[PDB]
């Protein structure tokens, strides 16, 4: 057709541009620090009367001698998966340090239970959004919920009320 405007992607020129930008920013920071490090005197008068000063200083010092932090944290487990009255320990999920992602809590035992259940389904599954079968491949989804204020997660009451409403509609 009439091909549109295209910027040439040059990796070497890009690296040279970044190097120049970094050098200019470093020079700016150097001069700013020099402005800051100028207003402070660098004295870090005589000899014998200085010893007299020291004697006076010795006299002077002699006279002087005489659950809230867990708000907003995400748990990568279904709420129903927790049995009632059982204390479960949640560990922090492994994340790369060079990865900005919200911290997630996870219990290892629930994880291997979920993996076993998924494999059971996969063996059972012997072979709607548009082409929903590719949602796992495209977007990559464990059930999760977020802790509220005080670390308390109160969401099962809403689901119970929904179930009660559905049953009442059935009745």
């Amino acid at each position: 057709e009439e091909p549109v405007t295209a910027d040439v992607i040059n990796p070497m020129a890009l690296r040279q541009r970044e190097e120049l930008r970094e050098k200019l920013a470093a020079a700016k920071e150097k001069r700013l620090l020099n402005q800051k490090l100028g207003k402070i005197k660098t004295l870090g008068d005589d000899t014998a009367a200085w010893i007299e000063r020291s004697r006076q200083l010795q006299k002077e010092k002699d006279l002087a001698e005489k659950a809230r932090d867990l708000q907003g944290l995400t748990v990568e487990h279904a709420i129903d998966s927790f049995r009632e009255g059982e204390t479960m320990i949640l560990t922090l999920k492994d994340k790369g340090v060079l990865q900005e992602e919200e911290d997630v809590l996870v219990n290892v035992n629930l994880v291997d239970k979920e993996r076993a259940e998924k494999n059971v389904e996969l063996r059972k599954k012997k072979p709607r959004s548009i082409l929903s079968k590719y949602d796992e491949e495209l977007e990559g989804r464990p059930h999760s919920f977020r802790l509220e204020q005080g670390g308390t997660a109160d969401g099962l009451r809403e689901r119970e009320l929904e179930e009660i409403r559905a049953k009442l509609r059935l009745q």
């Binding site: 470093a26 920071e29 620090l33 490090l37 402070i40 660098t42 870090g44 200083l57 060079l98």
Partner: protein, 190 residues
């Protein structure tokens, strides 16, 4: 049989490089990390190990031992964001930026480390060696001002400032702070 080349060949080829940060002014036209917590090593089964501190290894020994310089830079950036009161994290970041031959960035980073972690020693006397001349003198003056005035940075000031005309004043200002140091008395006496 073929028996490929020893790994020492690749090691020496990649070692050729990482040249130097400075040159002795004698060659003519033709001629790092923390160590801030140790723990004493020594019935019942529980053993609280008393932990001590030597807080750095000041002298720069390691050099050019970094592969993936930008990955290491990102990692040390992450360290300094997550643990900004960690003096040797800043020390290692400054030494890494100094190793590559990026002196000014290392100087700025050690300035930010001194600003952010001032209650330490080795950060100040490594900023003194990274900063040149009068800037180093001002940095030592700041360290003397804030750090509670009973330290070795005073001998650093006396060493780097000037001749006896200013060395005497530096030693006087040192001895005026905690007048009990034998080294300061020995330096002032001669």
């Amino acid at each position: 049989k073929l028996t490929p080349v020893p790994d020492s060949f690749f090691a020496k080829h990649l070692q050729t490089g990482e040249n130097h940060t400075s040159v002795d002014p004698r060659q003519t036209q033709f001629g790092r990390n923390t160590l801030m917590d140790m723990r004493l090593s020594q019935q019942t089964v529980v053993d609280p190990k008393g932990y001590l501190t030597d807080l750095n290894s000041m002298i720069p020994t390691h050099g050019g031992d970094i592969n993936d310089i930008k990955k290491a830079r990102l990692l040390l950036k992450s360290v300094r964001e997550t643990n900004p009161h960690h003096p040797p994290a800043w020390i290692a970041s400054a030494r890494l930026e100094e190793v590559t031959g990026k002196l000014q960035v290392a100087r700025n980073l050690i300035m930010k480390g001194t600003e952010m972690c001032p209650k330490s020693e080795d950060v100040w006397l490594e900023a003194a060696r990274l900063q040149p001349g009068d800037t180093a003198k001002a940095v030592v003056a700041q360290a003397v001002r804030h750090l509670p005035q009973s330290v070795r940075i005073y001998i650093r000031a006396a060493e780097l400032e000037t001749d006896i005309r200013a060395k005497k004043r530096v030693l006087r200002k040192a001895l005026e702070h905690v007048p009990n140091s034998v080294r300061l008395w020995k330096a002032a006496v001669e």
